[PDB]
Swiss-Prot record, chain A:
Residues at which substrate binds: D7, S8, Y39, G40, N71, T72, T182, H183
Lineage of producing organism: Bacteria, Pseudomonadati, Campylobacterota, Epsilonproteobacteria, Campylobacterales
Pathway the protein acts in: Cell wall biogenesis; peptidoglycan biosynthesis
Function: Provides the (R)-glutamate required for cell wall biosynthesis.
Protein name from the UniProt record: Glutamate racemase
Family according to the record: Belongs to the aspartate/glutamate racemases family.
Keywords: Cell shape, Cell wall biogenesis/degradation, Isomerase, Peptidoglycan synthesis
Amino acid sequence: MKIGVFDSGVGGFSVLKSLLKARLFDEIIYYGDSARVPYGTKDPTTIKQFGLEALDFFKPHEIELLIVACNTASALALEEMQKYSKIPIVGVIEPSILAIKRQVEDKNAPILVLGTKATIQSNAYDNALKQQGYLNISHLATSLFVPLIEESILEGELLETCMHYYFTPLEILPEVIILGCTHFPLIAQKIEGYFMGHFALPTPPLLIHSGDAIVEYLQQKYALKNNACTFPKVEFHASGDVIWLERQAKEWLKL
Amino acid sequence: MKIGVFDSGVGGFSVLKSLLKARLFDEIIYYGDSARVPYGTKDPTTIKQFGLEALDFFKPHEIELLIVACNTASALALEEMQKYSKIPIVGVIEPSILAIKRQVEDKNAPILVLGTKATIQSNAYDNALKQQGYLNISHLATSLFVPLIEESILEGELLETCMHYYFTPLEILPEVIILGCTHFPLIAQKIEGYFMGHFALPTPPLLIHSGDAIVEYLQQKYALKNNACTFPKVEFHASGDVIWLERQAKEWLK
Ligand SMILES: OC1CN(C2=Nc3ccccc3C(c3ccccc3)=N[C@@H]2c2cccs2)C1
Ligand SMILES: N[C@H](CCC(=O)O)C(=O)O
Ligand SMILES: N[C@H](CCC(=O)O)C(=O)O
């Protein structure tokens, strides 16, 4: 099975890491729009067009399924992309809602959604959660986490201060935190550590990882493919420098 | 005179602000490539291609001069753009060198260049300064200042921590700091304050503002008096949502 994975840049590698572990797909065509990243700071019209242009990229590749690894593109462009695609397109938002339903029994559990400005502005998560009966949802655009993570600021005073900046105004302590952005898994332990330290919690809030949630969805849509692939072929493509993009895979994938 | 101003996004508004104050031009066409910003985190070939495409944008506008307000495009793309342009293109690097020549008599004065990653890696400032005999040049890509400033984080603990992050390893106290990025004028006083606080200075280092340096250059080159329109015709264009761009202009120009 040959698939595509689309992201604004290298963030999509956090989804790719999950995909690789699932051993579902024999061939993966990765495309990161690294000339135009970030998407999260930009507007619905721009991101929609970016999503359609991604469809054009994948045409000659004869993929069977397209994964939109980007939470921003999932929130803003997925519906438009599905309108103009014959293949299934799967984004990272809906599978996370499904993961919530499996992991969060109490409809009143406080859930906090973290994402880019565009993702949070869309209310994609809030709407889908409300539709599933969840009553206690907060959201926060933790925009600066993205550039910090791009700069490998994954610990230390600057990361702590940035987390404190965004989290300090929170009205409700979350029991569940959705990592609604490709980059956030890289600081998941730090986020857990923030809440435990600041609120004297012996264990952290439950974190939802977009890559693991999409994998859980795919593992049952393509059940015949579980553990099918001994070692996948992966092609790396970028609109920016493709060596720059591929170079980052080692870190993100823990190669 | 009708001119164009090119930037990656809204940062160019710090140059536009200088330009408007100087009353040099009757008409200004501003274009911010806000669908693709930042340029600073990307590679030379991509940035060069961005610069070439910006020329296409201005073609129907029949401008007489193109200003490249972006320090990143100036450092990486200016030479390529000039190669494909029939009109003069002026960037923000060379005018700042000329300002330093005027203002910094001591060739061994410690100069610190701040810029995006791409700008700093290009060594465009270092090379130009060495060419003019300056011997004591330091450089620092203060990359995260850009997103902080985009988010209007112009004060407080986050900014202070970020400045500390970049400035603490410095072994030479600068006499001159080049604000080698469109965004940096918006934290100029905070940068001044950091060095005075942390290095125990009665006076801050001299800060070189790219917008002010290009104004000085343009007046001399075109023999301009500060007597064009107080309120010129200004058009705003963007590759992203132009309403979003203009909304920000209102904040940066104030
Ligand atoms: O190296 C680091 C520097 N950097 C970024 N800086 C800029 C520069 C101009 C406009 C936007 C951004 C944002 C951003 C701005 C405001 C709020 C949130 C983000 N993130 C990019 C990014 C580049 C790649 C991913 S994010 C990455
Ligand atoms: N891939 C984006 C993060 C980087 C960007 O803003 O493009 C997301 O998951 O929201
Ligand atoms: N205009 C850019 C800053 C924003 C960007 O990285 O594109 C510069 O002056 O370097």
